[PDB]
Design a binder for this molecule. Structure first.
Ligand SMILES: [Cu+2]
Ligand SMILES: [Cu+2]
Ligand SMILES: [Zn+2]
Ligand SMILES: [Zn+2]
Lengths: 154, 154
């Protein structure tokens, strides 16, 4: 029983991309990321709470965090539901990677359909940077591009 | 049990807009529309099945139609769930209006969160135009702008 979703990422920058998501029943969610125009290196990549882009990517609110935990790495016990970690942009400015995660389902109470994905200006310090913002945003800086998670045919 | 959503409509031209949606429990959905850049006159306004904008507005698929009926006016018995009728653009190209509809909930099996709102080039003939496309699309022509229905703070 596969369900599928997609986010088209755009912003007030030259960064663009498409992210596809799929899930069987209540299993983990598979996320295929392809984003262009990125500065080579690490970029924070998160599922934010709201699929609201009225005033740009800041309208999407904070990292999706139904458990009221602090910011961490995807592999950590302590993390936000939306904490997908970093993606790596290559020398052509392309990040292309498939991630699998268990806190961003497409069905049920914590469904991320209608929320938003956001790619960030800076590396996500995973809560370990010892910076003022480490424990909330990973100090990932600005929101280069974002898109609402929408349903797509199976 | 209040729920709210929003769609930010964008497309290939200067037509753009913001549509807010709200629903208490499982009652009707109130829809506040503001769209600019329109040719003065009538424009079809529909909720399409998919929140997929990978191929511009065409990838949003057909009108949301969980009951598999033919295309109609919002007040008709025989209509698509997504059939919200026409909106009227004034001489300045602005269409601002509030609609209430009972087939576009924000929760449940027929929820429209993660689907898409689309504003059309032409008038929706409401299935009565005696046209080849009347009973599917209302012969409403091209898709000027569209946006995914995303969650927004209550
Ligand atoms: Cu983020
Ligand atoms: Cu339509
Ligand atoms: Zn976080
Ligand atoms: Zn229709």
């Amino acid at each position: 029983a596969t369900k599928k979703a997609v986010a088209v990422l755009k912003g007030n920058s030259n960064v663009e991309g498409v992210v596809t998501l799929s899930q069987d029943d209540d299993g983990p969610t598979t996320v295929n990321v392809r984003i262009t125009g990125l500065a080579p290196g690490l970029h924070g990549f998160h599922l934010h709470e709201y699929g609201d882009t009225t005033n740009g990517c800041m309208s999407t609110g904070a990292h999706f965090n139904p458990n009221k935990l602090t910011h961490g790495a995807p592999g950590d016990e302590i993390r936000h539901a939306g904490d997908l970690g970093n993606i790596v942009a290559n020398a052509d400015g392309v990040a292309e990677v498939t991630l699998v995660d268990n806190q961003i389902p497409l069905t049920g109470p914590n469904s991320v359909v209608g929320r938003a994905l956001v790619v960030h200006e800076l590396e996500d310090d995973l809560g370990k940077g010892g910076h003022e913002l480490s424990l909330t945003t990973g100090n990932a800086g600005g929101r280069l591009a974002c898109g609402v998670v929408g349903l797509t045919p199976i």
